[PDB]
């Protein structure tokens, strides 16, 4: 199944201790998941991501649910992102 999208999605791959991120887009939520795991070395199964807005776990099934440039933070199966706290 190759669902044809209307426009290339957009997201920002930000790491936790990298002090930087990887802005990249694509017409396939899955395609982005790979490039991110290739530049950050983070497999989908043994490694996922979490919205940097509220620490929302994101993967290849809940990534497209986010708008364009989705703050995708790096999160392996072991650490969790507290979430943009205001304390």
């Amino acid at each position: 199944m190759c669902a044809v999208l209307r426009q290339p999605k957009c997201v920002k791959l930000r790491a936790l201790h990298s002090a930087c991120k990887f802005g990249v887009a694509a017409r396939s939520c899955q395609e982005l998941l790979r490039k991110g795991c290739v530049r950050f070395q983070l497999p989908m199964p043994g490694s996922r991501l979490c919205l940097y807005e509220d620490g929302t776990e994101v993967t290849d099934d809940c990534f497209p649910g986010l708008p364009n440039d989705a703050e995708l933070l790096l999160l392996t199966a072991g650490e969790t992102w507290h979430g943009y706290v205001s304390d």
Binding site: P8, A19, C20, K21, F22, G23, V24, A25, K35, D69
Partner: protein, 100 residues
């Protein structure tokens, strides 16, 4: 080219209509207007304009405004025909420096 091409037939007109980005090399407050559609086109221009030797690659294009690394070619063509692209040939100072 007179063939009516505004949406029908492949080779659309909005296929990266040249993106005149402004490349800048750290240690030198000098921006350069470079018309490039796909990243490959921009990168090269930044190499001949900033002299990014191939020994400094992989180069890192981080936006001077935000600093997001642009190591792709599907999200850096959205900005208007003009953006501050800080070229970092694995040497130029980064646009972050713990500046959170």
């Amino acid at each position: 080219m007179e063939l009516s091409r505004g949406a029908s037939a492949p080779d659309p007109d909005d296929v990266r209509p040249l993106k005149p980005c402004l490349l800048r090399r750290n240690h030198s407050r000098d921006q350069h207007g470079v018309a490039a559609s796909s990243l490959e086109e921009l990168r090269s221009k930044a190499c001949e304009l900033l002299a990014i030797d191939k020994s400094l690659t992989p180069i890192t294009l981080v936006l001077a405004e935000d600093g997001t690394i642009v190591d792709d070619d599907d999200y850096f063509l959205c900005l208007p025909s003009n953006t501050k692209f800080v070229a970092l040939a694995c040497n130029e100072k980064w646009t972050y420096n713990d500046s959170d």
